[PDB]
Symmetry: C3
Subunit: 129 residues, 3 copies
């Protein structure tokens, strides 16, 4: 038969309309698209560099979680894609203000480039309660 996919959407977080969904929920599992440090009000990356962008990516992720009836506690795995491996600690310090206990599994590493010239992209898997 068909598959019961859900597509929770919020205009408070970015999307590439017609290319990807902010998130897809199937039964208990929520796949969240890679989040960038974009401000939906401006359509541009926030200023201030990797720390500001990482914070805004996680703010964006939180709006998507909330649209599905979830919160940061629901995240079970993230991948932190960095423009510069040197930013590991500074990004971790931002990250821990969102995931402060019961931490997701994680991988973090430096890639060549991200969409929109971003300095960080964060994807996630969450599970519904």
């Amino acid at each position: 038969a068909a598959v019961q996919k859900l597509f929770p959407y919020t205009p408070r977080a970015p999307i590439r309309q017609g290319i990807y969904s902010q998130a897809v929920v199937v039964d208990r599992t929520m796949y969240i698209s890679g989040q960038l440090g974009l401000d939906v009000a401006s359509g541009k990356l926030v200023e201030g560099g990797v720390q500001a962008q990482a914070r805004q990516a996680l703010v964006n992720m939180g709006e998507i979680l909330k649209a599905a009836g979830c919160g940061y506690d629901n995240v079970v795995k993230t991948t932190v894609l960095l423009a510069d491996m040197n930013d590991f600690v500074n990004v971790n310090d931002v990250y821990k203000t969102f995931f402060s206990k019961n931490f997701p599994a994680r991988a973090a590493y430096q890639v060549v480039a991200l969409p929109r010239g971003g300095l960080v992209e964060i994807e996630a898997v969450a599970v519904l309660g």
Copy 2:
């Protein structure tokens, strides 16, 4: 409750990975390259041709599990060059036209076989 669908119509690295693993209702699909099994080589024509062939390969694996593109819930698009982003998205959109997967996309240094694009995916089977 764990299946390993295989199709000779898509590539594999025998003894290294399965094309896909179906466990419960979730299907994990290996990173697909723009390889043509008939020639044993990457298709000619550049990143658009390779991205299309990768997605054709993914479709053959999906069909081997009784699925189609609608079952895909998440993909990761790995590019050799971020300058190919628009051209790859245009090909990508011809396979996923609504109810789109979640997605991550980024440029890496290099891919197996010298490919210009690799696409991995998670799909979910319907009841």
Copy 3:
């Protein structure tokens, strides 16, 4: 409602306290953090290059699997992150010694840099029996 999350822990694999859990198990699915070729006893990457590091990364992953009551046969998907794509065969040659049949799905690619200067990092998803 809250989602029920379990965090396998082994003293035989690394952990970044306050940043990530070695793995998260939710409703039979286990997300394993990216593993480097780190020797917990020495606090350093092992001697011997990418093949020694890949072996240690997989040994570490196996100890985390054991903490969840799992083994290598429970792994359903891995991602192999390389410092150098020319190491592909060498890493495959170590990787295949840990799986004999019913192999995980896999993705592999060369990144710019990994934490600790590692030459290879392997993340995984597993499913409990």
